[PDB]
Every structure is written in structure tokens, then in C-alpha cells.
Amino acid sequence: HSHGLFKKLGIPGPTPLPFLGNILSYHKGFCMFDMECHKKYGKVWGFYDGQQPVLAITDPDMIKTVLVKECYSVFTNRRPFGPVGFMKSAISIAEDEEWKRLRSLLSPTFTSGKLKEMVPIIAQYGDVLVRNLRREAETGKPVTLKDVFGAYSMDVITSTSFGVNIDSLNNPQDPFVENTKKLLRFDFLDPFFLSITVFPFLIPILEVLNICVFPREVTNFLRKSVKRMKESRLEDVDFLQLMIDSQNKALSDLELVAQSIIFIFAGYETTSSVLSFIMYELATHPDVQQKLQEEIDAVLPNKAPPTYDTVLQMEYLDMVVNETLRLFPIAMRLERVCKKDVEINGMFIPKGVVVMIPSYALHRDPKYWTEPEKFLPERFSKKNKDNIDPYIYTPFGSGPRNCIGMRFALMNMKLALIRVLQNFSFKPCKETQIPLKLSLGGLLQPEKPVVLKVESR
Amino acid sequence: HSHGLFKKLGIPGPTPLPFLGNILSYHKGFCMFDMECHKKYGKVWGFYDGQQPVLAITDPDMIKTVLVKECYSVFTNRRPFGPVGFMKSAISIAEDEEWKRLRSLLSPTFTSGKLKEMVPIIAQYGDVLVRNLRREAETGKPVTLKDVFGAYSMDVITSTSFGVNIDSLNNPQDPFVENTKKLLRFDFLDPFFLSITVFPFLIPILEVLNICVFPREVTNFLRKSVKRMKESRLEDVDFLQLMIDSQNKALSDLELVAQSIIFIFAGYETTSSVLSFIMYELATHPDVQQKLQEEIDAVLPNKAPPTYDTVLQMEYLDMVVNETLRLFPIAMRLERVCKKDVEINGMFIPKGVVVMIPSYALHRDPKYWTEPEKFLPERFSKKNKDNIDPYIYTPFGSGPRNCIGMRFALMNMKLALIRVLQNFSFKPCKETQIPLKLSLGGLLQPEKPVVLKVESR
Amino acid sequence: HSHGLFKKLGIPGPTPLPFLGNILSYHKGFCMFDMECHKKYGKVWGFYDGQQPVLAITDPDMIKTVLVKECYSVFTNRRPFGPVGFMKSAISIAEDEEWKRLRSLLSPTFTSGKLKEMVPIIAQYGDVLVRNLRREAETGKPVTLKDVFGAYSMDVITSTSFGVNIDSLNNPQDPFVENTKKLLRFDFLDPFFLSITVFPFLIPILEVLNICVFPREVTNFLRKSVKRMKESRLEDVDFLQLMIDSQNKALSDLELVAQSIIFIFAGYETTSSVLSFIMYELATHPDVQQKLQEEIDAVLPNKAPPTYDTVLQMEYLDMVVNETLRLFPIAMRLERVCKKDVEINGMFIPKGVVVMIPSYALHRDPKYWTEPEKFLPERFSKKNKDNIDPYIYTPFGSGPRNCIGMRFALMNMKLALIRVLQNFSFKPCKETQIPLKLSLGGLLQPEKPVVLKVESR
Amino acid sequence: HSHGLFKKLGIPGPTPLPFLGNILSYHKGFCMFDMECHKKYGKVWGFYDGQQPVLAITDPDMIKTVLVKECYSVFTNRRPFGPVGFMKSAISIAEDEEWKRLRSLLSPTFTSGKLKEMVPIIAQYGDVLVRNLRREAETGKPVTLKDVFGAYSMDVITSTSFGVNIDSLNNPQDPFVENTKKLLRFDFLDPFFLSITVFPFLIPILEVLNICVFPREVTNFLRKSVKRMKESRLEDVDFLQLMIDSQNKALSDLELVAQSIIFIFAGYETTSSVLSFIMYELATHPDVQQKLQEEIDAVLPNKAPPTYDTVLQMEYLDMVVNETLRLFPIAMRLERVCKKDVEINGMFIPKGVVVMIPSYALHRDPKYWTEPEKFLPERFSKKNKDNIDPYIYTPFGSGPRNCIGMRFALMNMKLALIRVLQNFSFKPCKETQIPLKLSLGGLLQPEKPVVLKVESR
Numbered sequence A, B, C, D: 001h002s003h004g005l006f007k008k009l010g011i012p013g014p015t016p017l018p019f020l021g022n023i024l025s026y027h028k029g030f031c032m033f034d035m036e037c038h039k040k041y042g043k044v045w046g047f048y049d050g051q052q053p054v055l056a057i058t059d060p061d062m063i064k065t066v067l068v069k070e071c072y073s074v075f076t077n078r079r080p081f082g083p084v085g086f087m088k089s090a091i092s093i094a095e096d097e098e099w100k101r102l103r104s105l106l107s108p109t110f111t112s113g114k115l116k117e118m119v120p121i122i123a124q125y126g127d128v129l130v131r132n133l134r135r136e137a138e139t140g141k142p143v144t145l146k147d148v149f150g151a152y153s154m155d156v157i158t159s160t161s162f163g164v165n166i167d168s169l170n171n172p173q174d175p176f177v178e179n180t181k182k183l184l185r186f187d188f189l190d191p192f193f194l195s196i197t198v199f200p201f202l203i204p205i206l207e208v209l210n211i212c213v214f215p216r217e218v219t220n221f222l223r224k225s226v227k228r229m230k231e232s233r234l235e236d237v238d239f240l241q242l243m244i245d246s247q248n249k250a251l252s253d254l255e256l257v258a259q260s261i262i263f264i265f266a267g268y269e270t271t272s273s274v275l276s277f278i279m280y281e282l283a284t285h286p287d288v289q290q291k292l293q294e295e296i297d298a299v300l301p302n303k304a305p306p307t308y309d310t311v312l313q314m315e316y317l318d319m320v321v322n323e324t325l326r327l328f329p330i331a332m333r334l335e336r337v338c339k340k341d342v343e344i345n346g347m348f349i350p351k352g353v354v355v356m357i358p359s360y361a362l363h364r365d366p367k368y369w370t371e372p373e374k375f376l377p378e379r380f381s382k383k384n385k386d387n388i389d390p391y392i393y394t395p396f397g398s399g400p401r402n403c404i405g406m407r408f409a410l411m412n413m414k415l416a417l418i419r420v421l422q423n424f425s426f427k428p429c430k431e432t433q434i435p436l437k438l439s440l441g442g443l444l445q446p447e448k449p450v451v452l453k454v455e456s457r
């Protein structure tokens, strides 16, 4: 249909099939498709998700123009995504003025100030993690990181968001953990979403049937569960409180539920998935593991409890986290819908085009990264951290729509790692997939789950 | 689904049925439904076209706020209408910045200046009208106005828009008149569009099938026919010329076709339908007919040819046209889609609500019109024309999005009537529907076509 | 659209709304709508589920013609039901020759012979039920029947179908009980299915998206779980065995899964729901409870273990079960799609019409039942059991497509009750809904769950 | 989805793309795709029209089994085709018992008896054809066959079906010819129908919107036009009469309209298209033209008027018609939907598979035709006509569902040619496309229309 767009504008790209566009090229996943296109075509290129034209861009100035400069004017929203039901009101999903309102109503929740107050509560579930791990370190049986990390990551969420306090690894069947684990980061290469991409005219069909990519049952569990806690604390420290206090243009109650749902997933599969990637890289590079175990003990001698300030003090820890996020940027791509005919850094961009930054492919670009497949934390030494274009390395996005939970996500993940490297070491098992292979699907996740050996220090 | 909207906001309205909303109430047509609601509920009210909330308003200040004040800011577009294909680019159909561009690129086409230049060509087809009529005035057989007026109205269009010059009543089968008559003002109460209103999620389905409410065949006839005339005049006075000269941000070629299509219908069924309504009212009020025949002869003695200036000179003619348009405002309603949460003249209007002015019901409101059903031209005497709220009487809309062809449409219609009342008189026949009954459907048209007796002066 | 059908044929019925047909009348549920129509219109009547014409019939001969006589010829299948995915192959859902094959391949599974072999295994979980109950009979706290019965009913299913052996009330979190409880008898008056009924043209839309009214996750759990047990028993007494042996025109493996799913639900919510209804009626009619506790002890003195033969010996037990099923026939209606133009017992029935028997309304018809709302088991005394038209009383359907699991369902339910009335008695609590109110929705279930007092004999 | 079908059954075919199946291979049209598959794969093969599995077959016994033997049992209907509206009732479109009824109610209309009675009326419009042609034979200007033949072919239809009698080439604008020319043989490779094939789940969507591949306006013209003529002849020789007499299980009135529509097209574009193909082959093989002009004059000396009997007498005329139909079999393919699991001539054919005979590819198969691209009428000499497998050469189909109008179509076409070769000869013009190229689309029609020189004998 609209498959002449890039051929006119003089932008190169893979030739689209009728109806499908270029989607059959996703058979190795977004990341691999993005790398190929980068090499085959250079700095800019175009392709079609069904009839949806997508313009990839790799110029840091141009990227900065889209993500920062012209964000409010032209590139305000992300690719429409449906069917979502009442989740239209989630911040990550909302548009234009509604999003601007929600970003405001929700920003002070994520300050360095409020973040320092969540430390002692986040500190408490680190210790729960250790005990579950030593039960396996004392029973010489290899460990799947995702289960134990997610048990931890969930434990922090439920708490930092509603006060609920479960040992999700040892009380995994209590009514709360059941619903909350039923979140699934959406495989955009799964049967369902490829059908969307080729039949996006079916989203409104599904919307009028109250179908939701968020299971209609988990949402109902928390919609009421919030209006219980809402009326329990009212009247008699967490995200809900910080959002309830805000509605005192102000936030509504079902909007509040929707943000709660986004926050819960946000820090579940993500925090847990990033922790897994770090632990893998640690186990397969044992020296880095040792160098970090030294710094954790120098700043916190005698296995001293990590504090907010001791965490920012640690610099090799930061380097490890960053270099992991370079090799596994869980978002893979950034995207904005171009809402007006515009011209940025010398290129005409018509209305409706989705503009896409290929984060995974830029993190692995040899034109900016020496030995880009190698896990080498020193790239982020304060000697070299200045050489790195913040518009090439973008694991949390950028501009007015970057990751709202970035600080919290780094803090949470580091508090988990300080505590864990104070007590154990991590070894490849025979069953450990080395080298790790990324799922060919639509998520940045390992093909096989990560299994390692855990020895008690 | 969204059927609680007005019940929350505290706006009264007829209770909606699931899925249908209030559409079953259209069984007497928009106009009658609008009158009822006006009386039942007062100054504002709400209802649902399927799941689409519609807020009717009748305050002239509030109407002025929507149609003029906040037009560019909030109320810029009309109710989405599909499937349209390439006709998305027609001015009457286009949105936001695209419309603003098209209104600019097309405005100077409709000036008092360019309009004075179309007079002598529009004058020529008036004489064709007379001859066809006297062939019936000399053959004592009653006449259907729509056929003879449309023959005339078409004759002016084809000319004033492309130079083509046919006697569409006597050369009705030439290739051009066949396609051009295949326009149909859309019965929004017909089977098809009621299905849209209850399944608007099916428009995108139909759009991806290249289905068009404008027959895919007539459009193809003129798409090429334009790019012929385009390349005939280039290189070797009408709307096409005025649009071709404009593309010399500038107008494209298929956009040019689309405007051509809108203009052709615009002045066909409308001009012809309004002429019919005037002739009816004239025949059933013979004194008004006489008073106007006197003024036509005082300004143009000896059946003098009407000129642009002699036309504006005529004031009872104007009164007749206006008072007809009061009783038959062919648009019935005006509408704008509310693009932001706003508050106008003290009422909150949420995003997405269609705001509707019920022109037909306001033209017939006894709270502003004495004996409103009576055809009484003197309402528009220069003694009384000042008493009339331009926000109650709105046959051409208002504000930046009023009828672009208003001046031309009045001129064309008056040039037709001066010539015709200079030569004939018009009498009720036995077959004449008295009093006229409006089609219960979705157009302002007579139930039965208007048949009259035509006697040669 | 097709809303003239019954008006032509001369069959009376409620006047249908456009698009909706008569569905708004479901606001009190099928059962109440059926009763009204029966009284308002008499022996036959028509109505529209959207555009779907439905002919209700209440003549026992005519009912026998449809359900038995012309079953194979004309009335072979049930109302199309979608989207179902691979569940198209379930027996209860399948059509024409495929169903005939599946009914054959699955019939010997349900014989009096094989049924006598399942007794000792079904006997074992009765004792599990007692212990869970006395833990509540010794802790003076009222009991919700559905939870304790479903715990039991599940326990029998998992066993009688796959050998799996869980105390689902005390091991409720083991991986098997989680998936298996995620069956939900479909509320055909819920948002989703009313949308089907008005947009049945959307089923094929949903089918091509691999959407399934059976959650795509539970099905995957058992599809593989079967092909595990399949390859565990092969090679090294239950329904799976009886189906695996059958494929040794023969049954396939995914067909086998689908039957497994139908059987699991079939005996879960149903058996458990019917048990609840009996216990309610028992508690609110304490004499019937006593009369039955006497017969259970006469045939099984000293709390003797019930056997297959001792179960059929018990006749007042049968009367209780039957009279409960009269007042709560969980299917509510029977239905067949008329596959040919036919004429049965003097009435023309066009192709495509769904023919419906209103079981609930016939069970409550005063023209066949004295004091029909009264729970009076003696109606089914061997003195009166002969007076009862098997085409008026139809809790298991009739003809070649009656309930395949009828015998098993009666046996299972009676083995549960003999054991339970041998040990406890059942008393109304203050919280007990008396009289019970049927859910206004699309299932025969109580508005409020049934809570009773349980005292240890 | 179902794209494993042929890979399992062990049938070879082109590998299908997701969603598209093999449809992209239609870029050279069905005929060319069919030839390739025949050569690449042999006697049987499979492919996918979207998700629709299609099994091509080329064994004459197997073809006879499908088209004749198992027609009523298994292969009764053609590939579902929609949206059709009330045209569901046309015979060529109807299914199962409804079709069997319509074939009966309509068969005696097409007998050798009734056909002999239509001769003198069909004879009359032959003479109209001559005069229009000599007006061009006397004005040395090349002639487009389709216009002049269709003018003739229409003239015979309107007459033989309703008595209406127009000179459609010289009265082409009368109200009847306008609607009747608005039939269009459907380009199944046009945008619309390829969208069906990939979204056949959208047919029911369109059916519920009263959209029709037969324009909703032409159908309305004749629905009423029939019920006028119906009530004009009733009460005060053609197909309508023969159908009206039949309803005196019997035919209804709107069914009657629908058959009328099928018959009108059937003999319009087809008869006219076949005539064009013959005239082309005649002009480009001048000896065949001469040999036939001799036989026409031997049987009809002195330009004697052809009679029914003189027509069957002519044998080289028959040979010409047949050999043309070999090279241009306007149906291209025959098709039946397999309604049951069956096994025919040693191959398993699952339910739902469309079984397709590739007539065009078999007519051009070198394994049955010497020099198959050559136009050589002698193939059909009574010496060689016996060598020809009626299951390889199938321009009118075969079995209970062959072309109902075959005899009439041959008669009509031959009466046209006898008259025309009695008076003119036909010569290539410079503008004549030699060799003719078949439209790459979805019809058997020439790329360019056929233009020839016409000289008066």
C-alpha cells in the first residue's frame, strides 16, 4: 500500500513484501535484523512493519534531536500499542498532554531524595536472598538465577510499591505472588503481536471486546486490591502512598492502579533479567568478579551493610553494571511516532513515520566499540567514561521520555549485588550455556536460562 | 462502554442502549430528533452515536467559542468519516495542519475578485436552462425541478471547474455527465453508515481494502481526466486553472483531484437542492414570486442580463434565498471534534467528544423565530436583518471552517433565479406535494420530488 | 437483517431490536427469559440472538423428534461456538462425521463395566473429603460447599483421568491443581460472549489470531503433560489409558488432549456445583436429610463402605439427586442447529435456525409440576417416577447426543454423598442465603456461594 | 497456520509464505502459475491461497471421479465466494440441496427443444450486427471486436431473457443498457479479491454490511424491473417466462432475479469474449477463415439464413470454435470443495481442501497436444475428435455441474459467426497485437483489445 515511501524519499532499505512489509526478516529477532541493516545500509534506513513505515537513525545529533530537542514538539509518543483497555492510562503507554500530566504527577516519586528513603526497606530483602541462596550453596546443586533473582526482585517491588512483605521464594503461593508473577514481557515476535503488525486494523476490533494484552484477571485483582489498601491506610513510604498523597489535573484512582501495574512489571522481569545477565558475565569472567569483591569489602569492611552513599561510592560496580547494559540493553530499540511533517539535521521526515533508534545495534557497533562483543568493564573507567557518546550508549533512553525508574533500578540492582558478592562466589556449571545465546524471539533474554554454581564465602 | 460520560458530567440526555447508543432515535431523521432533544432538555444535552458521545449545544456565545474562538486550538476537525481512500486529502475532510494548508492553498480561488470573473460564463448556462424549460412550458406537462436545476447546476460546475461545456439535459449521455452524476450525497441514515456508527472499528478494516464511499470508478475517471487537462492546458479561468497555477507546501496533483471532486458535488446536489426548495416556496407563496419578479425587472428592465453588481443590488432576492435556507439548511448540523480537555463558557468538555450545533433545530426554534414554520422573507428585511443572531442562523457554518464556497454558491443560485423569473412563472400542479415533507432519512431533501407548473411569461 | 423470519412463518415472539435482536432481554438471565416466553407465548416461539434466529419448542414429541428421531439427519450439532482453536476437536464441540467418530471412539470409556472399575479409586478420595470437613466440624466455623466439594471433585477427576493423586484442598499449590482450577464455565451473559452474539462475524477474526476461549496457557500445560504421561505409561485404569488404548479412523494425540480437557471441566464445576445444590436443599429441608441418612445406614450398616451395587440399591438417594437436578439443571437449555429445510410434527423449520429446548423452564412448568418451586423428592418415587415425561425432565439431554458422562456423574456424586451423610449433618448458618437466588448471569450458580454449618455425627 | 498440510500428506508444492501462502506467485496470473506447477511437480501438487489449501489434479480418471463420480457425495460446491448478498441464491453460487433444487428448476430452460425456439429471435440481432459493421467497413477505420460483439451479445441476452429489444450499439444510452453493461467479470488478481484471499475472515464482516461484489445499484434496477415485467406479462418465449412458468420447492421471486443476473453476465462478457478470440484467430490464420467461408456458403447458398439444423450441420465451424476454446478456456480452472474425508483413485483428500483442475494448463499440455500453442482446428476433425480425452479438454466443465448454458452459448456464438462470415472478411491492422498477449491479471482476456480490419464481401 504505502510501500513506496522510502523509495521516494531516497532512503535505502530491504524491499518489502505485500501485506507483510519486512516482517519475515524478524526470524532472527529485532537485534540481529537491526545489525544487518546497520551494516548493509549505513547511517539511516527504512523498512515496514506491515504497512507501518519505520525509519531507523544512527546519528547522535539526529538522535538527540528526536529524543530531546523536538521531543515535545514532534516526537512525543511511542508506537501505538494495543489492545490495552484501561491501561491506556499507564504513563509508559500514554500520549501527548495526558502523558505530560502523568510524568509530572509521578516524577517526584523517583527523586534522589525519596530514593534514599527506600534503602533500608530494600536492604531487608537482600538478606532474604542470601538465606535462600546458601540453602543451595550448602546443597551442591546448580542454581537458576532468574528464579532466585526474581524472587528477590518481586520481594522489593511488592514492598516498595504497597508495603506487602512476602518471602516469594518460600511463600510463593500466597495470593499476592500468584497474580503478580503472571506478568509476561510481551514477545513482540510471538504469534499474537506479529498478527497485530500485519492487522493493526484489528486492535480497535479487540478494544471493543474488552480484550487486553494485560490479562483481564490480574488487573481486576489489583484494581480492587488498591482500593482496599487505599481505604486501609486512609485512614490509619511506598509508591502507592506517594501516588495517593499526590491526588490530595490531579491523579485519579484507576489511573493510580495502572501506574502500579507498569511499575510492578517494570522492576520485575527487568531488574531480575539484568541481574541475571550481570551474574552470567561475572561467572564467565572470574577476575572481574574478584576485583569487584575487593571493592565491596574495602568500602564495606567486615561485610558492612551497604548504604545509599556507600553505593554511589562504588565505581567498579558501576562499570560492571554499565558494561552489562551495553551488551544486553533490555529495551533493544527506542521509538517515537513523528507527529508532524518535519526536517531534522537535514532530512525530511513525513508525518506518521515511526522513528527508531537501534540501541542494541549501536551498543555493538565496532565503529564506536573496540571488540564490541567482549565484556570489558574498563570501557567505563573514569578515564574512558568521558569518551562515550550518551547518544550511542542509551540503555535508559534519553530526553523527557527516558526511563523514569533509572536511578531506582540501578540502586535496587546494586544493593542486591553488594550483599550477594559479600557472601558467595559464582562458578560456571557444566550446564551453563557458554557463550550465552540470545533468544531469537522478541525479548532480550537468554535462549536457555542461566544456571551457575554458588559457593559460600 | 463509555455510556456513563454525560451521566457523570451532569448533562441530560436520552438513555442509550448498549452498542446502539441512541441511534434508534434516528427513525425520524436527525432534524426531528434534534428538535425533540431541544425541547425535552433545553440549552445543552448529550447522546451517543454508538459508543461516540455527542454534546449538542445551543448557546450563541458557546457556539461562537467553538466555531470561531477556539477553532484552531480545540475544535479544528469534523467527526472522523471513513472509508475515504485518497479522499482523505479533500479539504472538507482533512485535519489539523493539512487542512490549514489546504484552506490557504484554496482560499484565493473563492474571492470576490475571482468570483466576478466567473459571472459571464455562469451567465451563459442560464440561457440553456430557459430553452429546456420553455420546451416544457410549451408542452403543458408538469416539471420536476431537481432534473432541470441539476442539469443547470451541473452545467455550471463542469464549466467553472474544468472548462468542459455540455448541455447535460440534452447531451446527458456524453462521457463526462455519466460519471459526474454518479455522486450521491450520503444518506447517513442509510444501511451502510448506521453500520459504521455502530462498528466504527470497521473503517480501518475497509480502508485496508481500498474500499471507498466515493466509488472507486468515478474517482479514477477524473484522476486521469485531470492529468489530461493538466497536460492539455500546460501548455497552450476555472477552479482547476486556479489550482494548477497554485502549485507553481505547494499543492500536489492527487490533492488537486480530490478538491475537484469535493467542489463538483458541493455545487451539484447542493445548489440544485437549494434551487428546488426556493422554487417550491415561490410556487406555494405566489405573492412573494410576484414581488421578486418586479424587483428583477426594475433593476434589469427589458429582461436585462444580470451582472455581478446588479445581483448584489437585489435585496428581496437575498431575503428569499436566506429565508429558504432558514427553513432548509441542507447541512442540518455543524460539528467539531474536541481535541483537548477544555472548558468553554463555564462547561467542562472532555477530549474526544463530538460537539454538535443543530442548525435545523435552531432555524426552527420558536424562542428565536416567530411562526418559525412559516415562509416569511421579511424576517430578512434590512429593518429586521439586524435582529438575527449569526450564531443561531448558520446555513454556511461559521468561523475559520465555514463554507468556502458560500459567496459563489449564493451568486450561482441567484444568477439562475434572476434569469428564470424573467421568463416564467411557477404554479402548483395537482401532483405537487403541499405541504412538502422532508425525507425521514439522512438528507435534507423532499420525501417526493418537487413537481410544478411552468408558464411562459 | 433476517429479523422477519418468525413473523413470516407465523411463530410468535418478542420483537427484536436492530443488531441486538432480543439480547437485552437476557438481563435477568436465560432461565428467567425462557420462563416469561413460555407463559407469554405458549408451546413454540421465536427470538434472535443478534441476527441468529432461535426457535424454542416445548412439545415432548417434537422434542423427541429433534433430540432422537431426526438427530443424525437434521439436528446433529450444537450452536457454533468460537473461538476455540484446537478445541474444535473436543467431542462436545465437534460436528457431523467428526463427532460421530469421536462419540464412538469415546463411548466404551463410559460403560457400566468400566464404571464399576473406577469405584474403589473414587471411594478413596471420599475419605479425604471427610477429614478436611471434620477439621472444620471441630472448628465451629461455617463452610463454603463449593471449595470443599470442588476440592473433592477435582481429586476424583485428576485421578480417574490421569492417575495423578493430590490432596487439592491441602496440597492446592502443586503444579497440577493450579492449571486445572483455571477452567471457568463460560458466562454466556458476560461482556465477551454477548459481543460474540452481536458480532459472530468476529469469531473467524479471532480464530486467525490463535485466540482461544480456553486459555492458551492451560492447554499447553496439558498438551505436553499428556505426551509425558503418554510416554511414561508407554511403556511401563483411567480415561487417558482408555483413550490411549483406543488409538491402538483411530484417535490422534491432540484430539486425545482435547477430550481430556472437556472431561476435566465437565466433572469439575458441574459435579461440584450439583453437589452444592444438593447440600443446600438438604440443609433447608432437614427431614429429607434424616430420611436419607437412615437409608444410607440400612444399606451400609456400621458406616459400611459404599459399593457400586449398594449405590444403585439406594432409591431415596436417587430421588434426591433427580429432584435437585429438576430445580437446578445446570445446562439450562438444550440446542441443535437445523441443518436442512425440514418439517417435524407439523411445523416448517428452515435451515440455519437454532432449535432450543428450555430445560430450566420445563422443569419449573406448573402444567407438568405440582408446586414446581418446592423441593419435594417424592415426585421421583417409583410410584410416581412413571408419570414423568422423559422429554420434559431432561437434565442430561437426550438421544444420540445426551450427556456421555451421565452414569459416571451420578455415581461420582452419590459416592460422595453416601460417605458424607454417614459422618456429618448440615445446618443453615446465619450467613446462608435462604432462599437461594440464582445468579442473574449466564450460569446456573447461586448468586452468593453456599455456606452451611457442619456437625460431626 | 495450516501450512503443513501437503508437507505431511507427501504432496509436492511451492513453499508458502506466512499469511500469504503462495499468492505472490500470481504475479503472472493463474494460467502461467498453473503451467509452471504442472511442469515443476507433475501429476498432482498443492499450494495455499492464503491459509486455503488447494490441491491441483491432472489425472483424467481422478478428474472424472471429482467432477462426475463423487460430485453429489463429496465435491458438490465451488470455492466459497463472498460477499454476495442476495446473490447467495444464484445457481452458479449456491450449495448442496439448494443448488440441486435450482439446477432442477432451471434445467428445462436449456434443452435442445427450447433452444430451437430461440433461433429466430437470435437470428434477428445478427442482422443488426452486420449493419453496424458495414458502417465501419465503408468507413476504412479499424474495429475493436469487443465493442461490436458485446453490442451483439448484449442484444441477444436482453432479448432471450426479457423480451427487451434495443440496438445497444446505436441506442447504447437507453436506461436498460446502462445498468446491464455495469457487470464486470471479477479480476480475482485485482486488489480487492487478493485481500479476500488473505483475509477471508472479512467476508462475514462485509456480509453484515450489505456490501456486495455485485453493485447494490444494478441489482436493485433489475429486482424491481423483473417484478414489473412479472406483473406486465401476468397477465397479458424467453428465460424469464420459462422461470415464471416454473414457479407455477418451487422458485421464488428474488431467486428468479438472481438467476437472471447470472444469465445476463454469463452470456455477455463470455460470449462476447469468446467471439473476439475466434475473430482474432481467424484474422491471423486467413486460410482457416477462407475454408470456413466456403462451408457457410455450401450449406447456406446465396447467403441463406442459418437455421438450427443448418448450424449443427456445419463441422469445420465446430472445429474452429472448439480449437479456440482450447487456446482460451475462459474459466481457466475448475474447482470443487471437498466436503468429506475421502480417498479417490488412491490418494487421501482431507475435508476442506479445494480441489482444482487447471483447464488452461491442460489445454496447453504438450503431453496431450502437438504444438499446443498453434491454432490448428484439424485437431477436432471427426478423424481426430475421438482421440481427445474429454477430461483433458474441458471448456464447459463436466459432470452434474458443467456449464448449464453450453448448448445455448455454442449456438448463439455460431449464429453470430455464420452471419458475419457471409458478409465480411477480417484482416490484421497495424495496431493488431500479434501475437496476442493474455492479461497478466485474473481473467482470460487479451492484454490489449483486439482491433482488426473489416472488408465488405
Ligand code: HEM
Binding pocket: A067, A091, A092, A093, A103, A262, A263, A266, A267, A270, A271, A274, A329, A330, A331, A334, A335, A394, A395, A396, A397, A398, A399, A400, A401, A402, A403, A404, A405, A406, A408, A409, A410
Ligand atoms: C535495568 C532496568 C531498566 C532498564 C534498562 C530500563 C530502560 C528503559 C528504557 C530504554 C525506556 C524507554 C526510554 C526512552 O524511550 O527514551 C524505559 C521507559 C520507562 N521505564 Fe524503564 N528501565 C528499567 C527499569 C525500570 C524500572 C525499575 C522502572 C520502575 C518504575 C521503570 C519505569 C519506566 C517507565 C514508566 C517508562 C516509561 C517512561 C515514559 O514513557 O515516560 N523502568 N525504561
Ligand code: HEM
Binding pocket: B067, B091, B092, B093, B103, B262, B263, B266, B267, B270, B271, B274, B329, B330, B331, B334, B335, B394, B395, B396, B397, B398, B399, B400, B401, B402, B403, B404, B405, B406, B408, B409, B410
Ligand atoms: C447553498 C449551498 C451550500 C450550503 C448551504 C453550504 C453549507 C455549508 C456548511 C454548513 C458547511 C460546514 C460549515 C461549518 O462547518 O462551519 C460547508 C462546508 C464546505 N463547503 Fe459548502 N455549502 C454550500 C455550497 C457549497 C459550494 C458551492 C461549495 C463549492 C466549493 C462548497 C464547499 C465547501 C467546502 C470545501 C466546505 C468545507 C470547508 C472546510 O472544511 O474548510 N459548499 N458548506
Ligand code: HEM
Binding pocket: C067, C091, C092, C093, C103, C262, C263, C266, C267, C270, C271, C274, C329, C330, C331, C334, C335, C394, C395, C396, C397, C398, C399, C400, C401, C402, C403, C404, C405, C406, C408, C409, C410
Ligand atoms: C451432574 C452433572 C452433569 C450434567 C447435569 C450434565 C448434563 C449434560 C447435558 C444436558 C448435556 C447436553 C446433552 C444434550 O444436548 O442432549 C451434556 C453433554 C455432555 N456431557 Fe455432561 N453433564 C454432567 C456431567 C458430565 C460429566 C461428569 C462428563 C464427563 C465426561 C460430561 C460429559 C459430557 C460431554 C462430552 C457432553 C457432550 C456430549 C456430545 O456432544 O456428544 N458431563 N451434559
Ligand code: HEM
Binding pocket: D067, D091, D092, D093, D103, D262, D263, D266, D267, D270, D271, D274, D329, D330, D331, D334, D335, D394, D395, D396, D397, D398, D399, D400, D401, D402, D403, D404, D405, D406, D408, D409, D410
Ligand atoms: C463460451 C461461453 C462459456 C463457457 C466457455 C462456459 C464455461 C463454463 C464453465 C467451465 C463452467 C463451470 C463448469 C464446471 O465447473 O464443471 C460454467 C458454469 C456455468 N455456466 Fe457457463 N460457460 C459459457 C457461457 C455460459 C452461458 C451463455 C450461460 C448462460 C446461462 C452460462 C451459465 C452457467 C452457469 C449457470 C454455470 C454454473 C453451473 C452450476 O453451478 O450449476 N455459461 N460455464
Ligand SMILES: CC(C)(C)OC(=O)NCCSC[C@@H](Nc1ccccc1)C(=O)NCc1cccnc1
Binding pocket: C078, C081, C092, C093, C183, C184, C185, C186, C214, C261, C262, C263, C265, C266, C270, C331, C403
Ligand atoms: C452441552 C455442554 C454443557 C456439554 O456444552 C455446552 O453447553 N456448550 C457447547 C460447547 S462449550 C461447553 C464446554 N465447557 C468447558 C469445557 C472445558 C473447559 C471449561 C469449560 C463443555 O462442553 N464442557 C463439558 C460439560 C459441561 C456441562 C455438562 N456436561 C459436560
